[PDB]
Amino acid sequence: SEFITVARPYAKAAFDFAVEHQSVERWQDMLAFAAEVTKNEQMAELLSGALAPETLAESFIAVCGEQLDENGQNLIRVMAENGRLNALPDVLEQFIHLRAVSEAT
Numbered sequence: 001s002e003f004i005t006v007a008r009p010y011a012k013a014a015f016d017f018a019v020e021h022q023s024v025e026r027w028q029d030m031l032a033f034a035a036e037v038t039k040n041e042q043m044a045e046l047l048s049g050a051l052a053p054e055t056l057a058e059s060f061i062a063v064c065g066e067q068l069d070e071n072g073q074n075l076i077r078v079m080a081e082n083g084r085l086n087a088l089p090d091v092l093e094q095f096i097h098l099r100a101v102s103e104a105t
Contacts, residue, residue, distance in 0.1 A: 018071075030069060033065070
């Protein structure tokens with residue numbers, strides 16, 4: 001039950017500025033740590049709250065840690081607002097490929 005179609009643009013838009021802001025190297029952890037915590041059962045429990053997007057989004061920013069880019073924190077919210085916060089790995093996988101792409105072209 002993946003949602004790469006939703007992560008395609010989420011990871012793409014975040015990767016663009018990540019390259020312009022030279023954060024790609026540091027952002028790499030932000031995506032990994034973001035996908036690492038979302039894979040935790042308890043994280044899914046908080047993510048699949050009673051129809052509460054701000055609960056899973058804000059709780060994620062707090063559980064993920066303040067070490068998040070302004071686009072990274074907003075990305076989690078935008079993912080929560082659209083009910084796609086669980087698609088953190090879809091964005092991570094797309095980012096890994098996007099990163100490998102820019103390194104070659």
